[PDB]
Amino acid sequence: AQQKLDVKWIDKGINWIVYSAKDRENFTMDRWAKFYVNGEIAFCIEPNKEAAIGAVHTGANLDTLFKDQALRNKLTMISHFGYIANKDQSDEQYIATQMLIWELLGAKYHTIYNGLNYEARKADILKSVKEAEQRASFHKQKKPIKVGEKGVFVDTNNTLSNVKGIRTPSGVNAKIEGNKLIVTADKNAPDNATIHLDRITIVGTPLVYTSGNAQKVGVLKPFDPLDSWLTLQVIKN
Ligand SMILES: [Zn+2]
Ligand SMILES: [Zn+2]
């Protein structure tokens, strides 16, 4: 509930950006706060304010700050694919992710340090977020399957390589091989057995952290596994 805001400073003697956001006009950022809250990577979500480093914040659900769910979704997508689940953990990626989050909350960049490689970093993030909307060709379908008999289901949308986890009820085995979902169900399987193919396996509730009038900080956890799913109608006979 009550959490201290920690930081790691990114300072290379470089003006990272010259930006404007709300009342804050033509502000030069010559260092960057990489925020942590209780071990977890956080982002500033009010680009016109300074954060209260070292102070006790109160955690509340992200919806207290932002009503619009599509925005809340997008902010968690950018956090997730941009940095937390990204292969590149560099200071530059963190900054790019923070900067992209800030673009959605009204920040405008007049100057950007060329060494960020910002446009290329941003583009790869938006591609990852857009691809996460795509679902398998068998998404939401019901398919009959006899107990014992191994079934194969082809995803003609070419999305199964993005699957990070598989949930199945007891008595159902489900594996991925290329664009094929390989399935077998036994007598312990329920009559309608749903397989979930998750894109995200570190799902949680996104929190906003507030200390006084200082900058609000988000632990922007994705709250949806973004699964393609398929329901098997298990034939007992
Ligand atoms: Zn320094
Ligand atoms: Zn400074």
Residue numbers in the entry: 4 to 240
Paper passage:
Internal thioester bonds, formed between Cys and Gln side‐chains and first identified in the second thioester domain (TED) of the Streptococcus pyogenes minor pilin Cpa,3 play a negligible role in protein stability, but are suggested to mediate covalent bacterial adhesion.
In addition to a TED and four IPDs, the S. aureus SaTIE protein is predicted to also contain two ester domains [Fig. 1(A)]. Continuous electron density between Cys and Gln side‐chains either previously shown or predicted to form thioesters (SaTIE‐TED: Cys296 + Gln467,5 EfmTIE86‐TED: Cys88 + Gln292) confirmed the presence of these bonds. The depth of this pore is longer than, for example, a Lys side‐chain (7 Å), strongly suggesting that in order for the thioester to interact with its cognate receptor, the surrounding tertiary structure must undergo a conformational change.
